[PDB]
Design a binder for this molecule. Structure first.
Ligand SMILES: O=C1C[C@@H](C(=O)O)NC(=O)N1
Ligand SMILES: O=C1C[C@@H](C(=O)O)NC(=O)N1
Ligand SMILES: [Zn+2]
Ligand SMILES: [Zn+2]
Ligand SMILES: [Zn+2]
Ligand SMILES: [Zn+2]
Ligand SMILES: [Zn+2]
Ligand SMILES: [Zn+2]
Ligand SMILES: [Zn+2]
Ligand SMILES: [Zn+2]
Lengths: 363, 363
């Protein structure tokens, strides 16, 4: 017998369109999402061109509306030039993304003062998420306190980071965070198998002690999110390997395996892939939407999953238990046993739904 | 201009039917809910007869389906006789309620061993909430740890209690809690005005220091919930005053006043009256459901609100800013400017909706 789950939400995916469509596009990345039991995705802005201004957002919105097979919201990206310019379009985005460590020149911020300017100008009711590693977590938390608002920390990967966030929560500070599956299910012990190119990811794979600290501190983790970051094998194995792993198709099977082993409960999983994503990002419900999983099916992850154009996976060879059998999205069968049955363009921008606007006080 | 809020959820109401219908019934109590911007309520089991067995739950379900004007779920109550007997009906309830301090003989538990028996036998995926004051909070937390599951603490009212829960959360323990408006907006300073009969409530009104501690520790409060506990003025002013305040019609106006004063944000309010109730109790979304409020309207709370049969209020004379103008419930206008426009029986048991079952692992 199957277990019915609600429509799961992945708040951190890179779908590569516009500009990197050999790595993934909206159609292939949302097929991967559906096959992973994900019915809503929030897409990051580090595309080509990057989503750092209103014209780029308008283009990305149309490409997503035409290509997405599941529902979505699109992040805006902070740049060294756009603070104070996004007010008209801010509410149409998933939130604002700050890249505070390595990134493309276009999203690079050169000074903490530029972080402050974004925290001061971005509407105070709308989400801000940050790629912030190691001491950068503490630094961006300080900026958030100076500007008296919340922040969400992307892909927490280290004991150091989860304990800092734990200490901030103990002081009542408004901070939430997410953890990606590779930081729960891979470690330095896997680098020999992966090799130095495939193994490149940011944040990097942690030690066994980092992984054990994230599990021990599950109560501190608000969301799981894949950081689906597809690149082709040629790129990962070449001379300048880009960081990132594909992850939409493997995230839920890995976590269902952990549920079956008693490492966390089904409820713990649903808080982190459904309820907390909804409440942190004010994402709306999806009517008549659910996912049926088979928790008894044992399988081994292959060298590539069927849908992502990345056409490789760092989880190859891992034994999992749990698999997505059927997905229904807004009353239509979207996925059954390896077949996606909704076309490109079936998905919608949830921020355009009446229930998908972030509530705010009047002017 | 009005602000659109989602359908708010009150996880702690006493609607008095069956058996106390001069105090309130499903029809009057859910009218009060709608007028307060509440579209879903969870009704407590200390009725007459109390909802402590399958026949009593079946009766209450039919009375609620026939009388409720907003959607609902019904709690089961723990008794000294029913542990291990509720398995067939448990999933149809909001959760299990434990009355661990004063209550009716029928819901009284005489030993902590009886609490353990309930924690051991009630299905582990379903909610347990407790009326647990002062050291009882620590005691029920110990039982929850011994049985390796979560607990939700009702109406936290004291500095002592919120700090204990804060310490438990810092240790990663699975505990959530709610706070009622009277413990945020009334104190010992109001007892002279209220008098000793009207002022009777459990948990009792706190000191100014208790109130200030709850506000200071807002980050620890997961939900607001009214503990709507209607009794008539004759009862409150008579020789054996029953404890409790009506609160559905005043909760949102009081909290909107606090939002307008910057004491908490609109988001803080919506986490506590919408998102966290959903996720702790696995309550489903309500399609095409929303509440429109006017945040600029100043008014003074009168001697009784229009709908509750309690026909009195302890907040009489308080100045508030914010008022419910319109409620839409599942596509129908349910309330406009003092008129309820859905009949008794419009409301439904959300636990019977496919999306309203609590997910669980198979047998
Ligand atoms: O910060 C990032 C971004 C991402 C990408 O490839 O877009 N991949 C990563 O590994 N880290
Ligand atoms: O515990 C309770 C229950 C309630 C009631 O009247 O049912 N009223 C109270 O004041 N405390
Ligand atoms: Zn990142
Ligand atoms: Zn993220
Ligand atoms: Zn990323
Ligand atoms: Zn929301
Ligand atoms: Zn109580
Ligand atoms: Zn309660
Ligand atoms: Zn109560
Ligand atoms: Zn749920």
């Amino acid at each position: 017998k199957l277990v019915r789950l609600p429509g799961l939400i992945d708040v951190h995916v890179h779908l590569r369109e516009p500009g990197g469509t050999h790595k993934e596009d909206f159609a292939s990345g949302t097929a991967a999402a559906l096959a992973g039991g994900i019915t809503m995705v929030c897409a990051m802005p580090n595309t080509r061109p990057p989503i750092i201004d209103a014209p780029a957002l308008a283009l990305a919105q149309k490409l997503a509306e035409a290509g997405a097979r599941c529902d979505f919201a699109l992040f805006l990206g902070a740049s060294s030039e756009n603070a104070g310019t996004l007010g008209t379009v801010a509410g149409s985005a998933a939130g604002l993304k700050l890249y505070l460590n390595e990134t493309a020149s276009e999203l690079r911020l050169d000074s903490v003062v530029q972080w402050m300017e974004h925290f001061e100008t971005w509407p105070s009711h709308l989400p801000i998420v940050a790629h912030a590693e190691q001491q950068t977590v503490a630094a961006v938390l300080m900026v958030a306190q100076l500007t008296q608002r919340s922040v969400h920390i992307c892909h927490v990967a280290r004991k150091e980071e989860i304990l800092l966030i734990k200490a901030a929560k103990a002081r009542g500070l408004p901070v939430t965070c997410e953890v990606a599956p590779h930081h729960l299910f891979l470690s330095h012990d896997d680098l020999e198998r992966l090799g130095p190119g495939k193994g490149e990811v940011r944040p990097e794979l942690g030690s066994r002690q980092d992984v054990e600290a994230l599990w021990e501190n599950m109560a501190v983790i608000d969301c799981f999110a894949s950081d689906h970051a597809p690149h082709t094998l040629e790129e990962k194995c070449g001379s300048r390997p880009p960081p990132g792993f594909p992850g939409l198709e493997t995230m839920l099977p890995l976590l269902l395996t952990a549920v079956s082993e008693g490492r966390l409960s089904l409820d713990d999983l649903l808080q982190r892939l459904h309820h907390n994503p909804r409440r942190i990002f004010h994402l709306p419900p999806q009517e008549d939407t659910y996912v049926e999983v088979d928790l008894e099916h044992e399988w081994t992850i292959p060298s590539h999953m069927p849908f992502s154009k990345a056409h490789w996976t760092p989880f190859e060879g891992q034994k999992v238990k749990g698999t997505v059998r059927r997905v229904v999205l807004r009353g239509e069968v979207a996925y059954i046993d390896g077949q996606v049955l909704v076309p490109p363009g079936y998905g919608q921008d949830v921020r355009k739904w009446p229930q998908g606007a972030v509530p705010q006080l009047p002017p």
